[PDB]
Each structure stands twice: as structure tokens, then as C-alpha cells.
Amino acid sequence: DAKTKVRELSADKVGGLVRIAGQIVRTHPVHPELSRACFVCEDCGVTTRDVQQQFRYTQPTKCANPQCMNRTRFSLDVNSSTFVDFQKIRIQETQAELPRGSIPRTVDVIVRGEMVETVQPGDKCDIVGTLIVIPDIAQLSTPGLRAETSNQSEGITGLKALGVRDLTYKMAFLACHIQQTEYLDLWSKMSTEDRATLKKMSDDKKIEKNIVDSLFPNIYGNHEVKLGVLLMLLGGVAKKSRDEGTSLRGDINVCLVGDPSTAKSQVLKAVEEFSPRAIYTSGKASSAAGLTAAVVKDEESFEFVIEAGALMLADNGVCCIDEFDKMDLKDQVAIHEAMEQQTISITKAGVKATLNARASILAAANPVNGRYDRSRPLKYNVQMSAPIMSRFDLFFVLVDECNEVTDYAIARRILDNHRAISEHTERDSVYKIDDIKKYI
Amino acid sequence: QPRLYVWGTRICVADVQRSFRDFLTTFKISQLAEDENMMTGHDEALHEIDVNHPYYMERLLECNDAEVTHINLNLKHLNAFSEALYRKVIAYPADVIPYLDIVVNEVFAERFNRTLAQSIELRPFNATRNMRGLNPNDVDQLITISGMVTRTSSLIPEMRSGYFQCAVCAFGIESEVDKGRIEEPVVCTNCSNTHCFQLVHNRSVFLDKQVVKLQESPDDMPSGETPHTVSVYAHGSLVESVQPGDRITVTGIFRATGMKVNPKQRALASVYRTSIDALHFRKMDTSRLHQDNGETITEERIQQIIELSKRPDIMDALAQSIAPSIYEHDDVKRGLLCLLFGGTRKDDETTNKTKLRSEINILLCGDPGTSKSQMLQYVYRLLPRSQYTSGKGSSAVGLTASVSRDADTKQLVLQTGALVLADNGVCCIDEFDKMNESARSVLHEVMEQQTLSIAKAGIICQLNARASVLAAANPVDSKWNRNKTIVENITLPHTLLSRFDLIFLIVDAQDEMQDRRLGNHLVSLYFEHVDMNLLRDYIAYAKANIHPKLSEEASQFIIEKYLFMRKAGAQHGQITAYPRQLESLIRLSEAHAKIRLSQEVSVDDVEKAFTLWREALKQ
Amino acid sequence: FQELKIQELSEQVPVGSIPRTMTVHVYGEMTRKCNTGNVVHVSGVFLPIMLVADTYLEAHYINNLDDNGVQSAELEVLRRKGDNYETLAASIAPEIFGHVDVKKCLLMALVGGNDNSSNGMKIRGCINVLMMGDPGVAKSQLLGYVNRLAPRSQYTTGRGSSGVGLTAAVMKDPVTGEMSLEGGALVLADGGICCIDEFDKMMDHDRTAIHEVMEQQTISIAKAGIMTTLNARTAIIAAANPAYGRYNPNRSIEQNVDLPAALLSRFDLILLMQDKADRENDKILAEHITYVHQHGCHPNREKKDLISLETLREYISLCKTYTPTVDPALRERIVEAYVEMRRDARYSSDPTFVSPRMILGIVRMATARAKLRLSTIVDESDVEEALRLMQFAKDSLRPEQ
DNA sequence: TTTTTTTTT
Ligand SMILES: Nc1ncnc2c1ncn2[C@@H]1O[C@H](COP(=O)(O)OP(=O)(O)NP(=O)(O)O)[C@@H](O)[C@H]1O
Ligand SMILES: Nc1ncnc2c1ncn2[C@@H]1O[C@H](COP(=O)(O)OP(=O)(O)NP(=O)(O)O)[C@@H](O)[C@H]1O
Ligand SMILES: Nc1ncnc2c1ncn2[C@@H]1O[C@H](COP(=O)(O)OP(=O)(O)NP(=O)(O)O)[C@@H](O)[C@H]1O
Ligand SMILES: [Mg+2]
Ligand SMILES: [Mg+2]
Ligand SMILES: [Mg+2]
Ligand SMILES: [Zn+2]
Ligand SMILES: [Zn+2]
């Protein structure tokens, strides 16, 4: 129960048991790691066992035979040594941690054994473990290894292995336990409370109204838009041709166009708050690399790697793009090429790959001349290309009605929002949002 | 008798300690004029310092009661006591500071008969120079300089003592690291093997270190110089005590170090790198509205503020005291007063997010030679967190946030812009009509939702930017044209125009009497305003303590006025009103009640806010 | 220790070739004698770095030719004489015939007024001049002479300069990957004069960069990973042609001078220089120019004294040390002049733009002539001379009306 | 690799 914030990881707290929370950015592949080793003396053939490894590959300081003078000439034995499964991960500060005017911090995390590959990018997690310090192991020279800097802000000096060189350190978290922060057999298993509540919800004949009025309590009217977004959350059934390899896409796409102050950004923000795997973006602050997936190369390693961008973190979820019409044509072409195939392809430097991008897109835009013109068809009022416009199941157009009764109703809804916030008071919805989350 | 001397100087350690013990036990002179950030202590919550006692003996009570572990030593007091000791402190800080500490700890232990978790530490401050005026004579001397904080690093562990373990028999030894160097044991005293020990890193002891980058102030400099930057190193309890965007003064030791020609080899370059080891950060400044949530104000000045609030003239008295050199423009001054006060904060505290915007945005649009830039300069100088940008000097990425590749790790990293540095402050944007459209169009998300969401290569996150935007511009033709309407003299998108809470049209009313009065005012510069010290305390107290709520009568009245706004905005050649303007009216009403120090918004407050909004635009 | 890079001077370069550079190491008391944008005389020893070798210059002595209680005897005669204003006006570029009032305007721009900082609000002290005229009337010759006369000054043309070369630039170092700032012409000219030739042919989005410099005397930048403010305390002297290469007497002043009002209000003086054929003046001008081509020097037919360029530079440097204060009795004269000036712009058929910057311009010119007189209190004679020059500048824009 | 800026076509 003793949570600490990421910025509180002082050098005082090395070696103690600590809990922390963060969002995962990268998940490196799996390697075996040496833990306890056996070495054969090349002079006399005796095996020396259980040489415990540090961060660096090490040979014994002395032959186990008491009548032998060797201290250098050794050979490792593989079939007597013990190997450990290993994984390295990077995490980032969650948004609720951040101080005034600040950019999030990042940490490197080490995982071992049965916890390997138990978590994916985009997850938000709690970690229990300890804080450790790891050195710059490339500066040392021993039997069996010379220094990499010799092969190819002030540190510690004095060691036999550090002839003229110096040693510096980095922080890392050595995880002891990691987890995420939050069909008939499953239906049987959620037995008393969940089956009772969800069966009552399934029996409810006005569940459409009762769900939309709880998902969007702060918005008046727009029943068509509310129902369309609710159906977008559920989606259709994806189907594969049994031998052709072709498939029938089950994902639904929605687009919103309308006049200023018609609650487009309100709808998109509400969807991203509700859904478990949804992401929100702005078209003015995005690039084709960051939107869907990107190529990066490492500097701890030196090989090329793939970053899962926002669409792949929202795979089997919703990607919300606000101000879609203000994107560059390059980035719009990248989105259209991904939407056509539901795949992303990479061919750069020394990596080629193909990826999956099964995400539903929700988009918002403003009309070209500032206000929607009813005297022309939809092709002229929106700056999208016709191939991109072909990708959307539903278009919705929102206009200012200039009507006294609707103006009065909108004003009352806004002041009810302000009044409820002013006294910390909930509205009386039919269902809880958590119950709706369980149902969906 | 063996005796200890500082190498090559004939200073003996103990004779300084005698005089400093006398200084601590005896000095009481300056306490009639105790400073703003030094006049309160605490056992619990806050308490006020008494004048009549020896001052540092009084300050030691805070270390006993609240368990504070440091003393801020004002060097002007020491210079008044004895210059012969002040000279030694400034000339040899790397040698005498480890013993004045021990005198403080001795006096504390004698006075209170008590021990603590860490030693009480000294921080000398208020010794001033410029970054360019430093010379090789100043190496290892005490200096103080000032500037703005742009960047801070992550923490670095710095070892003080290592831990060795024998590989053969598991015996273990500690070893202190000193002069930058550790000493490795050779022979194991238990099992008598040689060249046998291995260092265990995580059994050893470390300390915190942080790097801070500091920038020159541009004001003092001679002709043609561009501003410089300096590296400042913070150790221990000073770590993470400052943010980017803050303006500070630093007192520390000026140092110089060598660099290796190759990292592989022993040879050194004969030109040395320089930096500062910090000892004290100060951020107190009396020329601005203060930066500290108003915790330290006395009961008597709180009662003076409460008495001042009962004038019926309170709006005019506060407004006309702002920007005193500017003649007339009283409506614009009242608008700037509303910008300074703001509405009620409305945040989700579980997620630390703004539910609704409470900051007020203002546009000034008018003829040339009407002091719009001067009003921007006054607002820029008044506030603690402020930024000023102008014209085509900005880019869309520089205003918000940028991605760049790191120097050594070669990763892509994110770094701040103007609107993120102006968080809980004001951004002033001059020549607003002459920006690039790409640079101007990123303001929509910040001005409406107070957040900033980014998606670039390997970087997907969201930042908070709770800034207030104040802008100035010309019409399309640079002089206002009477053969055109308001929405043709201004040309901005309706999406941008609807996000301002106030728009001020400033058109030259051509009149001989007004010309003569303004000419007299301008010529006189070559030949009941509220005090700044009271205005600071008034604004800080009001912000910390007043949170207006709407009355039911006011809510009904606000709906009626919004319907009138919707009808008035629909006429030809005029700015249309959206549902956003209802939120604007609520913000202005709360600002008026906040100036009056009232916990409730009244119909009179709504009437004054609506009158100000209407008369700002009917020109 | 300090390090410099030094470039060849233009007269030293061979024909059709670009100048070269060299690295210089400076030690001890010779440091801090130079900054960027200076012309120097250097003595030093040429050495290698410890079989092909790299080299540098180890400086022994440095002298600023920008800079170099002592007074010359020729200046002592002037300082004892007094009444020097007419001779000082005549001594600016004596090869150029006439334009006495234009030379007086340039003489005032070379000195300027006082900076004012009342109650935290700053006001610019220096004077801005815009010249216009028909082709072939010696605008470029006057700008070249002013550039030689001023201590620290820069020269630019409308085509050869970007809005980043005038203000300041972001430089991306390819070796390190770093970003840095690089000061442009108005930064290098800080404390001095910038001359801008062919001012009408600059692009609008390049021209609008000087709006902040001409009134607030700062440059402020927010780009990439940089956010700073730079000082630019410079006077600007500009030259242009009218809107179609010649003045048109059928079109208005605003049509002849094709500049926006916001930019026009930032210039303290605006002048027009015509070329019109006349059978006596053409012969007199031909006599003057042919004498200069004969003898290499101006005629001086009246045998009056004229001042050398070096001692004129010395005298202007002496004039800049004074800060004369305004007499409070001049208030009614200045304010009444401002009101009378503002009446005509309402009630004229061919008006110009007038704004509250005008009265500050009047005060600047009065203090400038007091500095030229080396007095410490402003006189009503100086106020009257400022009003006379402003009246001349106004009347230049309506010839033959 | 990807990102940001200023001159050139
Ligand atoms: N039907 C509605 N019910 C309640 N509030 C509404 C409604 N329509 C608009 N609003 C209000 O309109 C304001 C603007 O909302 P917003 O989400 O920005 O719409 P928008 O169309 O995305 N604005 P923009 O991004 O400029 O086009 C908010 O204060 C909403 O509360
Ligand atoms: N009412 C006034 N009070 C004080 N100073 C004034 C007033 N009117 C004009 N001035 C002066 O006139 C100048 C106005 O310059 P400035 O501040 O740039 O105005 P502006 O509105 O920004 N004009 P511009 O930036 O070109 O569109 C300054 O020198 C001011 O001191
Ligand atoms: N009054 C004059 N006295 C002496 N030389 C003159 C005079 N008028 C013109 N000239 C000569 O005319 C030539 C052109 O001078 P220049 O300075 O280029 O004119 P300009 O005003 O710059 N024309 P332009 O740059 O095309 O607008 C030079 O050789 C001058 O010496
Ligand atoms: Mg929106
Ligand atoms: Mg201005
Ligand atoms: Mg010319
Ligand atoms: Zn052996
Ligand atoms: Zn041992």
C-alpha cells in the first residue's frame, strides 16, 4: 500500500521495497541471461562451480585445485551453467503525477523469469520491487573481456580494472511484480451480482436511451449522433474467407462536420474518457510516424526497432482525431493507406515488417467556408478527398439552428453543469457508468 | 602542540570559530527591518519572528520545533558584524564552510540538549556580477548571479563510500571515496589471498545531484552582445526546488575543471571548463505580484485589505493604479484588471485536470499609435510567470513544444515552449495579425481546453497549459476604415474570434480638446493610486481566499442576457454570438465578485459584466 | 584565453575572388578588445600545432580601428569658435551639390535625442529618416558617406537581405546537432546606424520584421528549442524610389508613397528629392561635377572653411556625451504646434497620416540640436529649428502646388 | 531513423 511517485525516487531509497505506477512505452524481446556458471581450468581440467555473476561476465579469481597456480586460463561449460530469462522495459509518468509546467519523466525497468512478456505497449501498470543502480560496464577490463571503448560529470577512479578510465552510474527499477492497474463459461463465472445486474439491463426495453443519457449527460439533443457513436463502440462481426485469405471488415467509422460551438470536441473527449483502449489526438500536433506506428533505432542496442503508435495502441479500440481537416496531405495519405488495408508496412534501413491496425476511427472537422452551406452537396463543404470520404460509414452534419427554444434549452444545460460542479453533486442517471462499462 | 593551518595562507581554524560563535550568540541589530521571506517561522502552521532576541538564536527554535535542517545566512548581517570574517568567508568558501557548520551544530546541541537526523547545514546568500565579467582570479571564490531557468536534468547518483567483498571467503569491507578517488584493498585480512576483492555496487552509498541551465538577463549588457548560458550544479536538499520558467538569483562557488583529449587516455586539454556549485537559490522579488500563494501576510495587513475593499470606488481605484503612465483607456484598464483576477478554479482533483476554463482571454484591435504594445509591456512586467512573443518571431512548434535528438543517448526528447512555460501565467502576443497562419492556428486547443496533446515518433503524451492569452493587432488596412463593417475591418476566423472573452475596438476619436489634453500629458513626462505593496497583497489574498458561487436570481438573469446577445449578434455586419459567450459572461461576473471579495455573484455583478462586454465592442 | 577568426579585408582580395580566414589565439591583457563586427590591426607570430602541420596566429597586439581626454588642435579651434551648425551641415559629403536641409536632417539623425524611462515606461531616443527621390539624385552617395562617418554602422540593400539576416537566425550545427542563435545586421549595428538602400523593393514579409525594432528596440524569438530577447538600439536611415520610379503630380501622397500607415508613423522624417530640368541649375551642377572630375576635390570657390572627415567624426563623438534637459517653458509652444499640425490632416484634400508619435519626434529633434550646440539646456531657438525642418519635410511632398 | 529551419528552384 506504500505507493511513491516517480519523481520521489531519490538515491536514498536504493535497496528497499517500493511500489510505483506508470505507462509502458517499449517492451524489448527475450534473451537468456547467465546467472551461475561453471568453468574448467585449462591447465588441470578441474571444474569450478557456482561462480556468481554480477552485471558483467566474470571468471573465477583462483583455481579450485589447491595444487594449481592458474588464475587466468579458463573455459566456460554450458551444460553445467544456469540460464535466466530476461526482459527490459521502459515506463513513463502517468499524467496525474505532473507538476506545474513540466514534461513527463521516464524509467528503465528490468524483468526476469515468469513475468517475461506479460505486458504490452500502451498498458498502464502497477509495479512492486526495488530501486537499483547499474554501472557503465564497458569501462572495465578483466580476464575474458576487454573494454569496448578500447576496442572501438566525473566518474569514480582507483580500481585495478579501471587503468585510466572512470565509472559512472544509472538508475533502474528491478521489478518483483507487475500487473495492469485495472463465453458461456465466463458468464457462469461472473455468477451472482454481475449476472443479476446485467440480466436486468438486458431485459430493459429502453436501454438505448438509458445508456446514451448516461454516456453523454452534459450534451443536449443530437440523438442520432449519440446512437451512432454508441454503435461504433460495439461494432460488427469480422469474418474471414475460409481459403482465399480475404476478410470482411467489421469496424465502423464515423465523421462529424459542423459549425463552431456544436460540441464536436466534447463528444470526442467523452468517448476517449469512457473507452478502455481509446486515444485522443489533434491533427495539427501530429505526424505520420507518431499516429499509427514508427521506426526507431536503439542506442543501448544498435539495431532498428518498431514503436507502436496511437492507432496500434488503440488496436481493437477507438482513435479520435480532432481537427482532421488541418492535417498535412502527407499524413492524410498515410492514414488512408493504413485504412484501406488495415495494415502498416515498414521498409527502412535494416528492418522490414508488416503490422496490424484494427482500430475504429472517429473524426471531427469544420466546414471549409466557416459555416455549412446547405445549397451545395457534402463534397464541396469538406476539404477531404473522395477516396478518404469513401472510408466512413456515417457522416453527421451539425448546424446552428438559430431557434429560441433550443437556445433556452442549451443555456439551461450549461448552467446545470456549472451548478452541479459548484456543489460536488452527481446527477441521477438510471445506471452507473461502471455498470455500463461491464455491459459493453 | 600540533596545530592545523589552511595550506599556504596562515589561517588557523579555531580562531575563526570563536568569533563566529560570538556572532551567532550576540547579533540582533537588523531586526527592525526584517525581510519579507524571513520574518516568519513555525512550530506548526505559521508564526511570526520576534525583534528583541539574538536573531540566529531565534531562528534555531525553528530547527528544534519544526525540525528544519538548514539556516539561511544573510551575509549583510555578517559584514555589519565584522568585515574581517566576511572577507575570509568569501575568499575561502571551500575551506571554512566545513567548520562554521560545526559551530552551528555545537550551539544547537548546547542550547537544546538534543540530536537530529541530519546535521544543520549553512546556506550563505545575498553577497552581484555579470556572467561575462568573470576572470581566472575568481576561481573557488563565492559569487552570486541571476537569470531565468530553462531546463533541469534528471537525478544523478554520486557515490561517497564503496563496499568491497572478497571473492573467496565472502568477507566485506567499506572504503570511503574522497578527493574524487577510492582506494581498493589488495590483501584479504581473513583468508590471506591477494588481488581478490570485487566491488558490490548496490551495497554502497550515494547522493543526489542535478544540473540546471541558467540564461543571462538581457537588460544590463553592452552593445552587440548576445546572452550567455551557464551550468549550475545542485547537491542534496536543493534538488528539484526549481522549475523551468522561473526567475531566480543563485549564490555559489565558481569552479574550473579539465577535460581529457581522448576518453581512452591520460592527456588533458589546457583550456578549462567552468561551472557553478550552488549554495542558495532565491526567488523573492518585490516588484511583481508575489509567487507564493500569499501564505505570509500579517493579520494587520489582511485587515487593511478588508477595510480597503469597502470603498465604492474599488474598481476605479485598483484599475487606474495599473499602468499609471498611460492616459485614459479606463475601459481597457478594467478589462486588464479582470484578466489579472480571473474566475473560480474548477478542477477534477482525482485526475488533476481542468473541467472548465477559468482564464480570461483579451484581444486589443485598433489604430496605430494608441499604446497597445505599451499595455502589453506593463502586463508582461507585472506578473511573475509571463512570456512575450511578437509577429513572425515565433513558430507553431516553438510556441507549444518541440522534439529534438539527445546529445549522448541519441533518443528523441521533448522540450517546452512559450505556452507551457507560461502555465498559471500570461502569454502576450504582439503583432497578432502578422503571424504565419500555421503558427497562429495551434492556439485553438490551448485557448479552449487548457491542454496540449502530442503524437510524434515515440512520443505520445498530453501536457497542461493553463495560460491566459493577451493579444494586440491592427485592422486589415492598418488604419481603421469606416467604409467597411466590423467583421471586415477585423479578418480572423470565427473559430478563433469566439475564443476571446473580451475584444476592445480602439478607434481614434479625432477631437482638438482630446489632442490638447494628451499632448500636455506626453510633454509633461520630460519635465490616490493604491501602493504597489498593497496591490500585491490584495490580489494574492483575493485569489487565495475568495471563491464566488452563482445565486439563482443571477442564473435566471444570465439566461435572459444570453438570449439578448443571440438576437443582437445576428444583425448585418457584426460579430455573431455562440453558446461559448455564455461561459464568457459567467467568467466576467465571477471576476467582478472576486474583486469585491464576495462569496456570491449578484445581479449587479452580472449587470456590470454585461455592460463592460457590450461597451468594449460597440465602436 | 580567447579565440578569434579573422577575415581578409575587401581591398586585399585578388580580382574575382572571395576572402580567406585564419584562426587567432589571444592571451592576457589583449583579451576582450574585440567583438563581432569590428575591423582590427593585428601583430603576431605564426606557428604550427604539435609531417604535415596545422597552423594558427598567436596575437601580440590588437587595435580597433572603430575606436582609433585627448583633443586634436583642429577640434580645439571649432570648440573655441562655436556657431558651427552651418559648417557642420556643409561638411557632410562636399562633392554633392546642394541638399543643405537634407544634410541637416542626416546630421540630426547622427546624434539623436535622449532616452526616457518614466515610471517603468521606456521611450525611444533616436531619430528615423526616410529619403525618396527620382533616379540620379545621389541617395546612394549620401548613404555611403554616412556609413563611413558613423562609428558602428551597417549597410544593406532590399534585395540582398532576408528578414532573418536583418534580425536574428537559428543555426543548426551539422557537427554537433546543436541549435544556436546568430545575430543579424540590426543586432551587429547595436548602438549605431543601419542604412537600408532600395527600401521599396523589399518583400512585405521581410519588411514587417523591423516593426518591433523601430519602436521597442528589441528582437524576441521563440523557435525550436530557443526563447530569448536581444537588444537592438539602432537608428534606421532608408532610401527608396516612388511607386512607379518617378513622382507623379497627378496622384496623391499616399499613392506616390506606397507604404502602410503603421510603418509610416515609425519614421520621424520623410523627404522627397526631385530632378527637374532648368537651364541655369543644370549648368551650375555641370560646372561642379566637371570640377570634381578635373581635380579630385570639391571647388570651394568661396574659400570658406570645411571640416575633415576624421575631426567631424571626433566632433560627433563629443556631441554624443551631452544630455540636455528640456525647459518647462517650451510646453505651450510644443503642444500648440502639435494641435495645429493635426488640424490639416483632417481638413486637406491631399492629406497625410498624423499620430501621437509626432510630438515625441518634435522633442527628439529639439534635444538633438541642443547636443549639436554642446549646451545643456534646450532653447526655443532649437524648438523653432525643429519646427522649421518638419515644415520643410512636409512641403517636400507637394511640389508645384 | 525523424524533426525543424532558412535559402533556393
Ligand atoms: N447541444 C449542446 N449542449 C450543451 N452545450 C453545448 C451544446 N452545443 C454546444 N455546446 C457548448 O459549446 C461550447 C463549445 O463546445 P465545443 O466542443 O468546442 O464544440 P466545437 O464545435 O468542437 N467548437 P469548435 O472546435 O471551435 O468547432 C461548449 O461550452 C459546449 O458546452
Ligand atoms: N494614451 C497614451 N498614453 C501614453 N502614451 C501614449 C498614449 N498614446 C500614445 N502614446 C505613446 O505613443 C507611442 C505608442 O506606441 P505603441 O505602444 O506601439 O502603440 P501601438 O498601439 O502598439 N501602435 P502599433 O504597435 O504601431 O500598432 C508610445 O511612444 C507611447 O508612449
Ligand atoms: N547633385 C549631384 N551632385 C553630384 N553628383 C550627383 C548629383 N546628382 C547625381 N549625381 C551623380 O549621379 C550618380 C548616381 O548617384 P546615385 O546615388 O546612384 O543616385 P540615386 O539617387 O541612388 N538613383 P537610384 O539609386 O537609381 O534611385 C553618381 O555618380 C552621383 O555622383
Ligand atoms: Mg471543438
Ligand atoms: Mg506597438
Ligand atoms: Mg541609390
Ligand atoms: Zn587448475
Ligand atoms: Zn577472503
* DSSP-assigned letters across all residues of B378-393: HHHHHSSSEEEEEGGG
| Type of residue numbered B46 | L
Residue A122 corresponds to which cell in the numbers above? Answer: 500502451
Strands (E), B153-228: 156-166, 172-176, 197-199, 205-215
Cβ contact (<8 Å) for B395 and C222? yes
Q: Which residue has the cell 526567488?
A: B283
Instruction: Indicate the SS3 state at residue A174.
Output: strand
Q: How many CB atoms lie within 10 A of CB B115?
A: 8
First to last CA, chain B: 91
CA of A299: nearest nucleotide by C1' is: D1
Residue in B371, B375, B517 to alter for ligand 2 test, most ligand atoms within 8 A of Cβ: B371
Q: Which residues contact C92 (CB under 8 A, 6 or more apart)?
A: C103, C106, C107, C142, C145, C146, C149, C312
Q: Are A365 and A398 in contact (CB under 8 A)?
A: no
Q: Are B416 and A101 in contact (CB under 8 A)?
A: yes
B270 CA from centroid of ligand 2 (Å): 54
Q: Are B400 and B442 in contact (CB under 8 A)?
A: yes
CB-contacts to strand D (7 A): A 287-290, 294-297, 348-349; B 395-398, 402-405, 410, 412, 456-457; C 162, 164-165, 169-170, 172, 223-224
Task: Give me the resolution in angstroms, 1 decimal.
Answer: 3.8
Q: Which residues contact C50 (CB under 8 A, 6 or more apart)?
A: none
Strands (E), C184-319: 193-197, 218-223, 226-231, 235-240, 269-273
Ligand 1 lined by B493 (C-beta under 6 Å): no
Q: Where are the alpha helices (DSSP H) in A101-206?
A: 148-151, 184-189, 193-203
Q: How many CB atoms lie within 10 A of CB A117?
A: 11
Cβ contact (<8 Å) for B393 and C221? yes
Question: For D2, which residue's CA is nearest its C1'?
Answer: B457
Strands A360-365 and A351-356: unpaired
Strands A239-240 and A124-135: unpaired
Does residue A262 have a known ligand-binding role? yes
Q: Which residues contact B178 (CB under 8 A, 6 or more apart)?
A: none
Residue A325 corresponds to which cell in the numbers above? Answer: 481537416
Q: Which residue has the cell 547579533?
A: B27
Q: Are C143 and C237 in contact (CB under 8 A)?
A: yes
Spatial separation of the C-alpha atoms in residues B194 and B430, rounded to whole Å: 73
- Bases along strand D below 7 A from a protein CB: 1-7
Q: For CA atoms B434, B440, B441, B445, give the dihedral sign.
A: negative
Cβ contact (<8 Å) for A289 and B266? no
Spatial separation of the C-alpha atoms in residues A142 and A165, rounded to whole Å: 14
Neighbours of chain B (3+ CB pairs under 8 A): A, C
Spatial separation of the C-alpha atoms in residues B289 and B385, rounded to whole Å: 10
Cα B458 to Cα A105, A419, B23, B208: the distances in Å are 14, 41, 58, 29
- Give the residue whose CA is nearest to atom 4 of ligand 2: B326
Q: Which residues contact B295 (CB under 8 A, 6 or more apart)?
A: B46
Q: Are B10 and B95 in contact (CB under 8 A)?
A: no
Relative to the CA of A219, which ligand 1 atom is closest? 3
Residue in A255, A256, A266 to alter for ligand 1 test, most ligand atoms within 8 A of Cβ: A266
Q: Which residue of B has its CA nearest to A422?
A: B549
Output phi, psi for B538, to 5 deg.
-65, -50
Spatial separation of the C-alpha atoms in residues B392 and C210, rounded to whole Å: 11
Q: Name the residue among C227, C260, C335 with its Cβ closest to that of B418.
A: C227
Ligand 3 lined by C289 (C-beta under 6 Å): yes
Q: Are A34 and A83 in contact (CB under 8 A)?
A: yes
Q: How far is CA A216 from the centre of its chain?
A: 26
Spatial separation of the C-alpha atoms in residues B523 and B521, rounded to whole Å: 6
Residue C182 corresponds to which cell in the numbers above? Answer: 546568430
Q: Which residues contact A379 (CB under 8 A, 6 or more apart)?
A: A386, A389
First to last CA, chain C: 66
User: What part of A 386-405 touches B (C-beta under 8 Å)?
Assistant: 400, 402, 404
Cα B501 to Cα B497, B542, B589: the distances in Å are 9, 21, 12
> Residues A404-421, buried b or exposed e (16+ Cβ, 10 A)?
eeebeebbeebbebbeee
**Residue C311 backbone zone (phi > 0: left; psi -120 to 50: alpha; other: beta):** alpha
Comparing CA positions, the residue from C316, C22, C294, C338 lying closest to residue C145 is C316
Q: For CA atoms B175, B179, B181, B186, give the dihedral sign.
A: negative
| Type of residue numbered A301 | S
Q: Are B194 and B169 in contact (CB under 8 A)?
A: no
Cβ contact (<8 Å) for B202 and A103? no
Q: How was this structure determined?
A: cryo-EM
Beta bridge partners of A51: A37
Instruction: Indicate the SS3 state at residue C289.
Output: helix
CA to C1' distance (Å), from A291 to D2:
13
Spatial separation of the C-alpha atoms in residues C48 and C61, rounded to whole Å: 19
Comparing CA positions, the residue from B521, B525, B517, B506 lying closest to residue C339 is B517
Q: How many CB atoms lie within 10 A of CB A227?
A: 14
Comparing CA positions, the residue from B94, B75, B87 lying closest to residue B255 is B94
* Ligand number, closest to the Cα atom of B578: 1
